[PDB]
């Protein structure tokens, strides 16, 4: 907690030196719960929560080839449909909150497309002569 | 959801391609809940059960060498004797099901060997002259 | 069942180009991979010269060769083709035309009859 | 790279054949061995060091190891004599070894 929200308005750029600082504060009585139950619940449903919105995003990142990386490269080309703005528009001067309201409907056509390169990455494995 | 269990029938071979539909498949009021105690533990057992699964799989494939692959090699032989079968009659008229059910009791075996080997790998990643 | 068919040249003279076209019958080449040349040398034996991916066009050459080889694919004719940059007595040998499936679950070959070259 | 021995082997009918193929560097398991007649393409006999083609009979067979690999050919008969080829698939240049020819008589 030295961060946890500090790069927010910095530029996309400036903001991808604090990946660890986000990504480590995502996953952080007696008898007052056993003797009430309904506080047990209120609280193992909060903890349940947690674990489980970690597991779907490392899920991704296993599907997409992108497993045990904050910075991953794909295959899939840039539609220039989805921004048509060029890099020094994009990683400078410009926050990632805007970034996401501006991408935002275009979120699924994205997932689609990086999970179609990685099944066709693994097809071309079976393969021992391969991409010559 | 668009093919849960679409390749059941398919052979082995085929099926091969639809590893990740099944796989991002596995790790999917208010008040009525809280005011009647009996259903919020029905309800969190249901999902602290589905991360445990999904968990101990990860694990083995980590342990193996496997970590982030759907289909992954390993080094150890296949013993004749747990299928007396070639290639051509494994990954071409075959499914999964029928698969399982003539493997199940070597399981165990298989799984014990994978272990050995990765261990055996790693020991031979402290000695800087080791293959040769 | 895959069929390899060639024909070509059968003399070259020193410092003119070789050139080998291999037909083939039962597939696309462009579906499959490993479509390749090999020749055979006199008092060497079998050597590769290099493959296609007719799924790509792109191809993989044996370095000795790097410098002369092309190796391309006509998608119209199905059928492909070696050609060697100017070449020399050297260069006499058996060529052929072959098929290599190599995959987690099938090892095949499919090898035609080949063409006789003579550089001289 | 590899070569083969002996570069002839006269043997008797009904005799085994022993050929080997000796690499300078481990090519792991990837190896094949291939026959040779007279006018032919060459053929499949072995591949992944032991193997069978389809299509090819138990008499032929194999074994070995990163550097050292054997093809034997058991109960030997007049239509097996050919150049038998020793084939390196682990890594790019493949190469193939001399070959080597067996008789029988």
């Known amino acids: 907690f030295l961060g946890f929200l500090g790069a927010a308005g910095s530029t996309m750029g400036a903001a991808s030196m604090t990946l660890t600082v986000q990504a480590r504060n995502l996953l952080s009585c007696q008898q007052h719960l056993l003797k009430l139950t309904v506080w047990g619940i209120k609280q193992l449903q909060a903890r349940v929560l947690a674990v489980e919105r970690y597991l779907r995003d490392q899920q991704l990142l296993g599907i997409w080839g992108c497993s045990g990386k904050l910075i991953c490269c794909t295959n899939v080309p840039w539609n220039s449909s989805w921004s048509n703005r060029n890099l020094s528009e994009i990683w400078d001067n410009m926050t990632w909150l805007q970034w996401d309201k501006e991408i935002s409907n275009y979120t699924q056509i994205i997932y689609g497309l990086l999970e179609e390169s990685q099944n066709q990455q693994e097809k071309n494995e079976q393969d021992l002569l391969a991409l010559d | 959801f668009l093919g849960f269990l679409g390749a059941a029938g398919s052979t082995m071979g085929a099926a091969s391609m639809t590893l990740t539909v099944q796989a991002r498949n596995l790790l999917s009021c208010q008040q009525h809940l809280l005011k009647l105690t009996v259903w919020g533990i029905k309800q969190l057992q249901a999902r602290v059960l589905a991360v445990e699964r999904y968990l101990r799989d990860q694990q083995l494939l980590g342990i193996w060498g496997c970590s982030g692959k759907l289909i992954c090699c390993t080094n150890v032989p296949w013993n004749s004797s747990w299928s007396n079968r070639n290639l051509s009659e494994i990954w071409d008229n075959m499914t999964w099901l029928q698969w399982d059910k003539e493997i199940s009791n070597y399981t165990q075996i298989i799984y014990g060997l994978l272990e050995e080997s990765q261990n055996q790998q790693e020991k031979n990643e402290q000695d800087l002259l080791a293959l040769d | 069942e895959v069929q390899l068919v060639e024909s070509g040249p059968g003399l070259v003279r020193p410092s003119e180009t070789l050139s080998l076209t291999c037909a083939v019958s039962?597939?696309?080449?462009?579906?499959?991979?490993?479509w390749s040349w090999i020749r055979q040398t006199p008092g060497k034996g079998l050597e590769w010269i290099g493959y296609?991916?007719?799924?790509?066009?792109?191809?993989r050459y044996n370095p000795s060769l790097q410098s002369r080889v092309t190796i391309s694919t006509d998608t119209s004719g199905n059928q492909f083709s070696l050609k060697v940059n100017s070449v020399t007595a050297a260069d006499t040998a058996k060529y052929y035309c072959?098929?290599?499936?190599?995959?987690?679950?099938?090892?095949?070959?499919?090898w035609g009859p080949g063409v006789r070259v003579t550089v001289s | 790279r590899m070569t083969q021995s002996p570069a002839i082997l006269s043997l008797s009918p009904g005799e085994r054949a022993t050929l080997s193929c000796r690499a300078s560097?481990?090519?792991?398991?990837?190896l094949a061995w291939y026959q040779q007649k007279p006018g032919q393409s060459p053929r499949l006999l072995i591949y992944?060091?032991?193997s069978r083609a389809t299509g090819i009979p138990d008499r032929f067979s194999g074994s070995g190891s990163g550097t050292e690999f054997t093809l034997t050919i058991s109960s030997l008969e007049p239509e097996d004599v050919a150049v038998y080829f020793c084939?390196?698939?682990?890594?790019?240049?493949?190469?193939f070894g001399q070959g080597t020819k067996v008789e029988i008589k």
């Open positions: 072959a098929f290599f499936w190599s995959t987690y679950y099938k090892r095949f070959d499919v």
């Open positions: 039962g597939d696309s080449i462009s579906t499959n991979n490993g």
């Open positions: 296609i991916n007719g799924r790509s066009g792109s191809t």
């Open positions: 560097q481990s090519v792991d398991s990837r």
């Open positions: 992944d060091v032991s």
């Open positions: 084939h390196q698939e682990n890594d790019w240049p493949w190469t």
